[PDB]
Design a protein around this ligand. Structure first.
Ligand SMILES: *Cc1cc2c(cc1C)nc1c(=O)[nH]c(=O)nc-1n2C[C@H](O)[C@H](O)[C@H](O)COP(=O)(O)OP(=O)(O)OC[C@H]1O[C@@H](n2cnc3c(N)ncnc32)[C@H](O)[C@@H]1O
Ligand SMILES: *Cc1cc2c(cc1C)nc1c(=O)[nH]c(=O)nc-1n2C[C@H](O)[C@H](O)[C@H](O)COP(=O)(O)OP(=O)(O)OC[C@H]1O[C@@H](n2cnc3c(N)ncnc32)[C@H](O)[C@@H]1O
Ligand code: NA
Ligand code: NA
Lengths: 655, 655
């Protein structure tokens, strides 16, 4: 038997996994990072929008602080997030930016002077004073009043990922790529590592550790149309689920992006519409103003996606051999503007769409983009299965609730990497594990037998036909608009798909470097994940954040002010087990209310919300009258925890 | 913390360790072999005499079988061996030779014809028939009536070691050199591996396994004068001893060789006197005939050593700045004979002694050569500490008792490697271990702290002066002739030396590649080993095999028909704890009697021996009269065990 030991095992080499690895390795814990691919190729590398952090450096960022970022996050989540976690996040984001700056991330900087900027409420001139010169800049992104999105020109995710990966190399972290975790090793409710398949040699290896952290990203590829890399299949999510103990949170909470290139899904940055990009239909008609007279194209991304689907359903979509889509016209911004401020988007449409944006319109359609759902953890990042931690998009630390803020996800990956990294390091250093070879052998032999059965299967089902059908079912029934009737149909078909995945037969019999065998064990995993999404969507009879039920259009703060928890305790069951974790309004710094975007009064008020709100207004007034600072007031409303190392306040320009 | 896992851990890369590694690796058990040096440089490589095995191929081997080899072994051991183990050995030796032949070992072969041979009772002509041509040859060695010592010209140990090492490479065994086991990891009476120090980097690593086998060789370097390589310091013996659970058997049973080159200790093969080499004193006088009128130069090696010391004590030794010695005259054999049959010995005297043997005499003196004592095991090779096995010279499987047969030790290394290898493999495959990180950390941290204390010690003792004094004490008081008075003095001084070794200070502070630090932790270990030897010698009031007490000249079969078992249960004690394991005459195929060599009636008879003897003669007669074969008779006298794979009989020329 092959066994590899390390004090801290990290599964996933994206921003979250790599940053957590830095945290453990810097304190002497031997750590290993497992990854399907070279870590610098992780999906994190594709982020071009930016990272949200309340620095308050630039003119349009002036006055920004943790409180404002906190409120945008909570309201954006439509109150589905754990507000204490959101607080941990916003207070740490500024230090994540600054640490990365010290690590060499080339953040775009502010230069003194006037600038021709688009405010879309007063596209005037912005002035940056001399004292702001040379500091980290910020741009309009995510719809926040305060511009706090930091960026490194047009490749933020890329430069951030490379810096953290390089730090891991500096520290001697053991990076092992083309290695896939296919099962978690656990006993007595504790996680001792993972069974890993070497994608090159086919060897099955047991990686044991005092603590295991899953940072495997999102599960967007269960959909046909997604902006995600082809490796975002949620297998990390599935192995946690298959332990029968760890739970997944809000898997039905999936966010879509309105303007990905159709049908590839290659992203066309938000800056397009933010600069002046126009959405047109089959007749070249600018339709957003018809649905949103005021906001128009600049409405909340959430609203734009809905309007786009509505317009298509009204029969105004463009017919295509790949399906219906709409148009994105950016030529109207002028060739000059495009080649100087959107040189990146121009290259995309040419290299892939084969068209010059300064002349022709780009085909677009809303597609799956971010996974708010994931492995459920406490505020420390630990799952119900002791010793198993999770961070990044793969988790449901839940700072996002039912709607993640644009720019908060790459921010979370690094921030969670830092925070969960500390708690994870503490766990690995203080915990003591009992590694029984009997248990290790059972898991390793179990997976070797599984691989053998797949290779020897005489089944007649085709894995690709099954995977492709799953993706259509998800796109057709679990998209932007959902209804009970279609969701019930989806669940039934997914369950049938799952059963058939067990009768798959493959042509190539080798155990090494076999992409076909890889699909054979990944697909069944993706189906169980899809089932948690679809079933969670069917059972959640309300509309909240990105989850829209046409048959239940209102946000129900009385019956659904909670979090869906999915599990799969019995390996024989074919449907996930769903339970609910209620959100306590008493522990909320901000009581439920109007989210800011979308129709008003579209939520069923909870009497407890009103009570808490009054309680909040009272505490504020009293303390505010007593001449108390925002910090003391915050503590009085909702105290939260932070590792000692990050307890400090964030110095800002002007203190 | 650094941890390495394997199913089967082998400590020692000599014939025994490498052969055992083949046994485990061939059945799919991941195995690691740790060694201080490249495995092909192990002491096993120096064997030039040969390997004893009852093939019965040559004329002088005609009629040889397991029974004859068995008797030579038992009588040679002066009845201190476990006869069942001796049976396992002799029955397997033939297959060890044959397996090695299949592995390419270039055994010298028989050619048809007459040959000028020295019988030293009738130096006549020997004839090899045509049917013997091409089969494995044998030579006169070890004083056995039947010539059964197989050899590959003048480098048997070398070719044997290389073949087994190459087989390990073929099978993918993990060979890790410049790695030293400095402590065994154990808990609840079970062994889970070893704490290892990387000699190059200084890293302290825990090697955990389901089973651990120690095959670290002998402990001859505790003596100033020895034929052993400089790495035979018995540290493997010491780490077993320091667990406080494993016991060492007959550590006082040390064998000397009569003619090593003085003072280097470089060996001058037995073939010298066997061919006609003459021992001379300070006056050039051939003295052996004076003490042994009949046998003379050709007396038992055991007797020659004693006579040599006696002659020196009579004041006839040659004075030298390194001490007193005698002369070995081989010139008398004629330059022609020497350069054709002893070309090897000629090169030795020239390359080191700087003299031409065909002209000048070589200085010689009896020196420590083989360690019968070692880690005590059952017939399977397992020690009292469960999961810890031992094989080769490092063990006291006890097929040697108090006097190992010339040619039986390289034979044992491979045979034990095969047999203990099977039982070891079985244990590793069937046992299940509970590896607690708490325990691993305790042992690893304990050794890191130890290394640090040695490097920070402000002690004023010099490690080399202490090591050199230990070696003089051993040579002066625990040699060929021993007496209570001197042994008591030796024990007291060794104990004092041990206490002072704790106040050692070293100049070089680095943790990596530090030969001085290596001595700092090895010396204290050697002292504890030396204490077991000296104390065992003091307490054993009798003369048996190689253990000669001038104050107790007789072999005491009444009070000392047992085996000395040494342990060190309390790390605070400064002297070893000694217990005794009695040998049951009822389980002996051959009752105690005259060993064949030395003075007659020099043993105190045990009434039980006489009873058993009669019982044996009876069983033989009856079964023999009933026309029963030697195999059925053997089973009736003393049944023994063998792994299934080696249960077969050995086909011989003539069956
Ligand atoms: C898709 C996307 C997302 C995105 C974005 C643009 C695109 C095209 N732009 C963003 C932006 O401007 N601002 C922002 O805040 N977020 C933006 N996002 C989303 C964001 O990039 C992601 O949420 C974030 O990068 C997620 O980071 P995370 O570290 O969690 O994950 P990852 O980078 O996807 O890496 C996952 C790693 O897991 C390995 N893996 C997966 N499964 C396994 C198994 N079974 N075994 C072993 N390793 C596994 C992957 O190989 C990878 O390294
Ligand atoms: C010294 C000698 C012995 C000898 C002989 C000639 C000489 C000069 N001629 C012989 C002969 O003709 N016929 C015969 O039957 N025996 C003869 N012998 C004795 C015989 O060679 C030995 O008994 C035999 O070779 C012993 O084999 P074994 O496999 O037991 O041991 P080894 O070869 O000495 O190797 C020991 C290994 O252990 C490693 N080691 C030691 N301590 C440690 C620690 N602490 N950690 C890790 N590794 C360790 C050594 O590096 C080595 O590889
Ligand atoms: Na998530
Ligand atoms: Na021994």
């Amino acid at each position: 038997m092959k066994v590899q030991y390390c004090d801290s095992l990290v599964i996933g080499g994206g921003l979250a996994g790599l940053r957590a690895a830095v945290a453990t390795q810097q304190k002497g814990l031997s750590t290993i990072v497992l990854s399907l691919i070279p870590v610098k190729r992780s999906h994190s590398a594709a982020a071009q929008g930016g990272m949200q952090a309340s620095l308050g450096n630039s003119k349009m960022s002036d006055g920004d602080n943790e409180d404002l970022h906190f409120m945008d996050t909570v309201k954006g989540s439509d109150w589905g997030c754990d507000q204490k976690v959101a607080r941990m996040f916003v207070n740490t984001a500024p230090k994540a930016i600054r640490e990365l700056a010290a690590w060499g991330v080339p953040w775009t900087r502010i230069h003194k002077g006037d600038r021709m900027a688009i405010i879309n409420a007063q596209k005037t001139t912005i002035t940056e004073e001399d004292f702001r010169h040379g500091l980290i800049h910020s741009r309009d992104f995510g719809g926040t009043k305060k511009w706090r999105t930091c960026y490194t020109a047009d490749a933020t995710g890329h430069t951030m990922l490379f810096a953290v990966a390089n730090e891991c190399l500096k520290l001697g972290v053991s990076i092992q790529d083309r290695k896939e975790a296919i099962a978690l090793i656990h006993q007595d409710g504790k996680c001792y590592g993972a069974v890993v398949r070497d994608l090159v040699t086919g060897d099955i290896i047991a990686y044991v550790a005092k603590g295991t952290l899953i940072a495997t990203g999102g599960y967007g590829r269960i959909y046909k149309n997604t902006t995600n890399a082809v490796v975002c299949e949620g297998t990390g999510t599935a192995i946690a689920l298959e332990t029968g103990i760890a739970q997944l949170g809000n898997m039905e909470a999936v966010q879509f992006h309105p303007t990905p290139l159709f049908p590839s899904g290659i992203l066309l940055t938000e800056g397009c519409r933010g600069d002046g990009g126009i959405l047109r239909d089959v007749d070249g008609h600018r339709f957003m103003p018809d649905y949103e007279p005021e906001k128009k194209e600049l409405a909340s991304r959430d609203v734009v996606s809905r309007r786009m689907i509505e317009h298509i359903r009204k029969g105004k979509g463009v017919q295509s051999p790949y399906g219906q889509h709409l148009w994105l016209d950016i030529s109207i911004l002028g060739r000059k503007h495009i080649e100087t401020n959107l040189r990146d988007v121009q290259e995309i449409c040419e290299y892939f769409a084969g068209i010059d944006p300064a002349e022709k319109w780009a085909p677009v359609l809303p597609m799956q983009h971010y996974s708010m759902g994931g492995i459920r953890t406490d505020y420390r990042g630990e799952a119900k299965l002791k010793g198993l931690f999770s961070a990044g998009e793969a988790a449901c630390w839940d700072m996002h609730g039912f709607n993640r803020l644009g720019g908060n996800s790459v921010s979370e990956a690094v921030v969670a990497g830092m925070i969960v990294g500390e708690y994870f390091a503490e766990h690995c250093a203080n915990t003591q594990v009992d590694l029984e070879t009997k248990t290790l052998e059972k898991f390793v032999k179990g997976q070797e037998a599984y691989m053998k059965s797949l290779v020897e299967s005489k089944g007649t089902e085709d894995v690709f036909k099954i995977k492709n059908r799953m993706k259509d079912v998800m796109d057709d029934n679990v998209g932007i608009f959902r209804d009970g009737p279609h969701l019930e149909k989806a669940v039934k078909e997914l369950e049938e798909l799952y059963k058939k995945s067990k009768n798959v037969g493959i042509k190539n019999k080798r155990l090494h470097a076999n992409p076909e065998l890889e699909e054979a064990y990944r697909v069944p995993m993706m189906l169980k994940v899809a089932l948690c999404v679809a079933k969670g969507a069917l059972d959640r009879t309300e509309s909240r954040g990105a989850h829209n039920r046409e048959d239940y259009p209102k946000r129900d703060d009385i019956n659904w002010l909670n979090r869906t928890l999915a599990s799969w305790p019995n390996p024989e069951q074919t449907l996930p087990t769903l339970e609910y974790e209620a959100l306590d309004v008493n522990e909320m710094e901000i009581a439920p209310g109007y989210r800011g975007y979308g129709a008003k009064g579209n939520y069923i008020e909870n009497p407890l919300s009103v009570k808490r709100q009054e309680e909040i207004d009272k505490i504020q007034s009293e303390l505010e009258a007593a001449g108390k600072d925002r910090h003391a007031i915050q503590e009085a409303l909702m105290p939260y925890e932070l590792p000692a190392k990050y307890k400090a306040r964030n110095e800002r320009l002007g203190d």
